[PDB]
């Protein structure tokens, strides 16, 4: 997550397409789940801390 | 099977002849788990054993399986220097497993264009002492006995 790149936040991307998501917590581009705004890593860390409401360790 | 002795599986007897041996053969004929299509085949072929024979198919079937059972087979075993093909008795269960495996195998080597025909003719030809399967059974038996010189490696 280079800073000049966290420019993403741009309601004015110029073209809706260029509008890519990023991790709300790290800036991580890839594996950025939509239901959380977080990335694949952050999602696991926080879920472990209990800060993700409802989120639980699934087993079946 | 390092720990146990591995018990044998039991199979639901045939939905017709009410025989387990039949189901065994059915499963060997099976493929990709299509047990329905598999069952059909044995049955159609089972019918074709009649109107070609005045005998009951089951008696035919059960005696083919019999002539294909090998009473001796050669197994390997390294004894410093190389591997010696050692002949030895074949257990009652492997005989059956081998016999059936061989029938489906020879059957499918036949030229007859459709399955049921192939199983049928192989069943028959086998019943009277000829056919791919019996050939195999005899090549095997000939293998053993052809290595009597290594009989003292019992095991």
């Amino acid at each position: 997550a280079r800073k000049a790149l966290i420019e993403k936040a741009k309601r004015t991307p110029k073209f809706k397409v260029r509008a890519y998501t990023r991790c709300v917590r790290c800036g991580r581009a890839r594996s950025v789940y939509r239901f959380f705004g977080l990335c694949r890593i952050c999602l696991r860390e926080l879920a472990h801390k209990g800060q993700l409401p409802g989120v639980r360790k699934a087993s079946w | 099977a390092r720990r146990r002795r591995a018990e044998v599986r039991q199979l639901q007897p045939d939905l017709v002849y009410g025989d387990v041996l039949v189901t065994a053969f059915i499963n060997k004929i099976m493929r990709d788990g299509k047990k329905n299509l598999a069952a059909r085949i044995f049955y159609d072929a089972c019918k074709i054993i009649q109107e070609k024979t005045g005998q009951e198919p089951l008696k035919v079937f059960k005696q083919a399986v019999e002539n294909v059972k090998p009473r001796m087979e050669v197994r390997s075993r390294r004894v410093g220097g190389a591997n010696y093909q050692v002949p030895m008795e074949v257990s009652p269960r492997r005989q059956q497993s081998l016999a059936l495996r061989w029938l489906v195998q020879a059957a499918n080597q036949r030229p007859e264009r459709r399955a049921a025909v192939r199983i049928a003719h192989e069943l028959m030809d086998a019943a009277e002492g000829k056919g791919g399967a019996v050939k195999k059974k005899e090549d095997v038996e000939r293998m053993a006995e052809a290595n009597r010189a290594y009989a003292h490696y019992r095991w």
Partner: protein, 127 residues
């Protein structure tokens, strides 16, 4: 008047109501050989009767939903066996051996990760 045993198999539920009569079995409306037929298996679902020696004494209205036909074929094997228990309980002493009363726990094993199908593991070279 009536008898009813449930019966389940591999995620299939079967309602089996046995009612004195000829012996014509129904399944979701369709005749027995109408919901099945073409399935050499089916015949076995009515084995519960044959064992106790029923058949010519009971008719059967059956409901079936969930999974696949061969599964249903087995759930029904319990219905006709559980309902056949409410009728005469001295029958349980004849289906115990046959095991028609035993529910079949065998079910699809979960698909694990790293693997391709729960157990089928991916292949490697090592060179």
């Amino acid at each position: 008047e009536q008898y009813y045993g449930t019966g389940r198999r591999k995620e299939a539920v079967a309602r089996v109501f046995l009612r004195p009569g000829n012996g014509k079995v129904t399944v979701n409306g369709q005749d027995f050989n109408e919901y099945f037929q073409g399935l050499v298996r089916a015949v076995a679902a009515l084995e519960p009767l044959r064992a106790v020696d029923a058949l010519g004494r009971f008719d059967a209205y059956i409901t079936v939903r969930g999974g696949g036909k061969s599964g249903q074929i087995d759930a029904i094997k319990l219905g006709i066996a559980r309902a056949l228990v409410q009728y005469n309980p001295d029958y349980r002493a004849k289906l115990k051996p046959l095991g028609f009363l035993t529910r079949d726990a065998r079910v699809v094993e979960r698909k694990k990760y790293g693997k391709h199908k729960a157990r089928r593991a991916p292949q490697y070279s090592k060179r």
